[PDB]
A paper describes a structure:
Somatic angiotensin-converting enzyme (sACE), a key regulator of blood pressure and electrolyte fluid homeostasis, cleaves the vasoactive angiotensin-I, bradykinin, and a number of other physiologically relevant peptides. sACE consists of two homologous and catalytically active N- and C-domains, which display marked differences in substrate specificities and chloride activation. There is also a smaller testicular form of ACE (tACE), which is transcribed from the same gene and identical to the C-domain of ACE. The active site for both domains is contained within the large central groove, with the signature HEXXH zinc-binding motif residing on the α15 helix. ACE activity is dependent on chloride ions, with the degree of dependence being substrate-specific.
The R522K mutant was crystallized with and without captopril (respectively). Whereas the Cl− ion is not visible in the ligand-free structure, the ion was clearly visible in the bound complex. There is no evidence from the electron density map of the R522K·captopril structure that the chloride is linked to Lys522 with the amino group located more than 4 Å away from a water in the ion's hydration shell. The chloride ion is coordinated by the hydroxyl group of Tyr224 and the surrounding water molecules linked to Trp220, Trp469, and Asp465. Importantly, Lys522 now forms a salt bridge with Glu411, which is part of the zinc coordination motif and thus involved in the enzyme catalytic activity. Lys522 is also within the distance of a cation-π interaction with Tyr523, thus further directing the side chain away from the Cl− ion. It should be added that captopril is present at the active site in the same position as that of the wild-type C-domain·captopril complex structure. Although its presence did not disturb the catalytic pocket, the ligand interacts with Tyr523 through a hydrogen bond and π stacking of its proline group with the phenol of Tyr523. Substrate binding would cause local restructuring to interact with the catalytic site and thereby also close access to the chloride pocket.
Residue numbers in the entry: 40 to 434, 439 to 625
The structure:
């Protein structure tokens, strides 16, 4: 009956609030202080939430979903029918929980040491080396070292992780874990749509790639860069070469039009991690969106502890499922990179606050890409020279191309990377890639999509995917690719709503109530409606589209084409088998 389904959903919501709140606190503690005690209590509260999930999941499966009138109730019960890991038998569930914890801990505590003495952590030590070093061998030491210590140490867990996560997926009606992850977008054409979006960004990426390769040839020498081949993976200023902004100094289009060092300016003007988040909060409220509760400032970990405690430094935002307690956990360094990250995380909080009155089962983004996009949209306006000057962090066509380049190194370079991560994982989950070929197929995709090669030939036992946080942490990655496409669509739509005219990249939406209103109406929908509805609320149309991102970067595309043609660059990497001779 229709009445029994409504009652079930009401009972689910009530009991879920209590249990999910309890789990959130226990998960917070392990992430903020990795010990043996906190690892145990997390696993005990893990079985508690699994107990609830199993109880209500089993009940939900007794309801005939498609023979149910109300669409909101129908949708909730359908989601509760997916038990996820709680579908595993007790022994497999215990093993699976143990593996995830083991992989995450291994990643978190891995260090790279000189035999002399000094041991380096990923953050900030190895990250800093990757960002600042302009010495080929020193970059190699950190690049290889991190893979040797973190990547290699994840390999022993991964095949069993794959087995158990696929099993849980099959027990919930999917064919494998990748199938289950993709289903979050509720879009049959997902794979085709993403491929077309990626293809639309080829002219821009290939031109950026060719230009950067030429600049690296200039700095690192003709003997170490093949102008028709892939770029060695350790030279892009980032451990994973996923964003390239840290090598801006090597690639600046107009060196005679330099801008202020914002990181130096932040440190100069005494910018605290707490000020960085206060500024993000101001931007949201300027748009007419919600301020963070007083409780947020009291309970968030906005900086790496000087206590010397082992933490998960990876930046994340937290919903405690009571509509009052929201937190950010971040090991914040004072720079521009983390100022954008601060807006990114505050975007998650805004989303939490906006949909807090919905049933717990519908308290997520329209799709995972939406949750990731919100903060980045505001950060786009923040990053403009106009806005950076109003923050006293900065003091012509040449400055224009320079700024666009800086943006391109982050936003454009990230496209092929964010695309490839789950292209790899989907093929691991569906069985196309076995443990014999994990690493080799990872590098095939790094070549195919990003046009990169490893500086050092990989050996048996290498598991370079393991050296990227989201792999041992089992966090789906395709959302970041969606985010980067759609955030430019949102920027474009909000800029139109704010009455901005002229080049899209010149837009700053600060204080625009019309912009804030479009985001608010979409964000309040939570997961209650198919994502194209939220897309239509923001942009006036229902599709994902790369046209906004292309429009944003159009002046840079023109510049890159002229510059690359001038030097006769080959677009792409026709000599695709080239690897460093060293
Ligand atoms: C299908 O059912 C949904 C959800 O129903 C809700 O959940 C059920 C399990 C039961 O507990 C119901 O009692 C409960 O309503 C219905 O959506 C709901 O619609 C009403 C409007 O009729 C919304 O109420 C609003 O509440 C705000 C409070 O801030 C007021 O300002 C508004 O004026 C308005 O009264 C309610 O929020 C909404 N619930 C959800 C979860 O979206 C829906 O009406 C129903 N559809 C059909 C076709 O019957
Ligand atoms: C910090 C966020 C998690 S909320 C993240 O993992 N990001 C943000 C963009 C890409 C990806 C990454 O760091 O690899
Ligand atoms: Cl790698
Ligand atoms: Cl995702
Ligand atoms: Zn995020």
């Amino acid at each position: 009956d229709e009445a029994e389904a409504s009652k079930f959903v009401e009972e689910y919501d009530r009991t879920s609030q209590v249990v999910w709140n309890e789990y959130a606190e226990a998960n917070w503690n392990y992430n903020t202080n990795i010990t043996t005690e906190t690892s145990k209590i997390l696993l005990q509260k893990n079985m508690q939430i699994a107990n609830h999930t199993l109880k209500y999941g089993t009940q939900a499966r007794k309801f005939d979903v498609n023979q149910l009138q109300n669409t909101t109730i129908k949708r909730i019960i359908k989601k509760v029918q997916d038990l996820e890991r709680a579908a595993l038998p007790a022994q497999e569930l215990e093993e699976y929980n143990k593996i995830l914890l083991d992989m995450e801990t291994t990643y978190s505590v891995a260090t790279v040491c000189h035999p002399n003495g000094s041991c380096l952590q990923l953050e900030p030590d190895l990250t800093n080396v990757m960002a600042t070093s302009r010495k080929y061998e020193d970059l190699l030491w950190a690049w290889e070292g991190w893979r040797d210590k973190a990547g290699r140490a994840i390999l022993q867990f991964y095949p069993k992780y794959v087995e158990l996560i696929n099993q849980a997926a099959r027990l919930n009606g999917y064919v494998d874990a990748g199938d289950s992850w993709r289903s979050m977008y509720e879009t049959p054409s997902l794979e085709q749509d993403l491929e077309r979006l990626f293809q639309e960004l080829q002219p821009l990426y290939l031109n950026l790639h060719a230009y950067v390769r030429r600049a690296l040839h200039r700095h690192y020498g003709a003997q170490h860069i093949n102008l028709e081949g892939p770029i060695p993976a350790h030279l892009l200023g980032n451990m994973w070469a996923q964003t390239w902004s840290n090598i801006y100094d090597l690639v600046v289009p107009f060196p005679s039009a330099p801008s202020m060092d914002t990181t130096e300016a932040m440190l100069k003007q005494g910018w605290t991690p707490r000020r960085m988040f206060k500024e993000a909060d101001d931007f949201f409220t300027s748009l007419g969106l919600l301020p963070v509760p007083p409780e947020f400032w009291n309970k968030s970990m906005l900086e790496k502890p000087t206590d010397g405690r082992e933490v998960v430094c990876h930046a994340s935002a937290w919903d405690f499922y009571n509509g009052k307690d929201f937190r950010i956990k971040q090991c914040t360094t004072v720079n521009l990179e983390d100022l954008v990250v601060a807006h990114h995380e505050m975007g998650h909080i805004q989303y939490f606050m906006q949909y807090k009155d919905l049933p717990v089962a519908l308290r997520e983004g329209a799709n995972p890409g939406f949750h990731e996009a919100i903060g980045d949209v505001l950060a786009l306006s923040v990053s403009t020279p106009k806005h950076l000057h109003s923050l006293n962090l900065l003091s012509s066509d040449e400055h224009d191309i320079n700024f666009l380049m800086k943006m391109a190194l982050d936003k454009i370079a990230f496209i092929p990377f964010s695309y490839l991560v789950d292209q790899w994982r989907w093929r691991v989950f569906d069985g196309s890639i076995t443990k014999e070929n994990y690493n080799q197929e990872w590098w095939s995709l790094r070549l195919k999509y990003q046009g990169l090669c490893p500086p050092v030939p990989r050996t048996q036992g290498d598991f370079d995917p393991g050296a990227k946080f989201h792999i041992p942490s089992s966090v789906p990655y395709i959302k970041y690719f969606v985010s980067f496409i759609i955030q430019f669509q949102f920027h474009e739509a909000l800029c139109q709503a704010a009455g901005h005219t002229g080049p899209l990249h010149k837009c700053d939406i600060y204080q625009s109530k019309e912009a804030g209103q479009r985001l608010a109406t979409a964000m309040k929908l939570g997961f209650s409606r198919p994502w194209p509805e939220a897309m239509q609320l923001i942009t006036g149309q229902p599709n994902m589209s790369a046209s906004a991102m292309l429009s944003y970067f159009k002046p840079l595309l023109d510049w890159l084409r002229t510059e690359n043609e001038l030097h006769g660059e080959k677009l792409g990497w026709p000599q695709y088998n080239w690897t460093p001779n060293s």
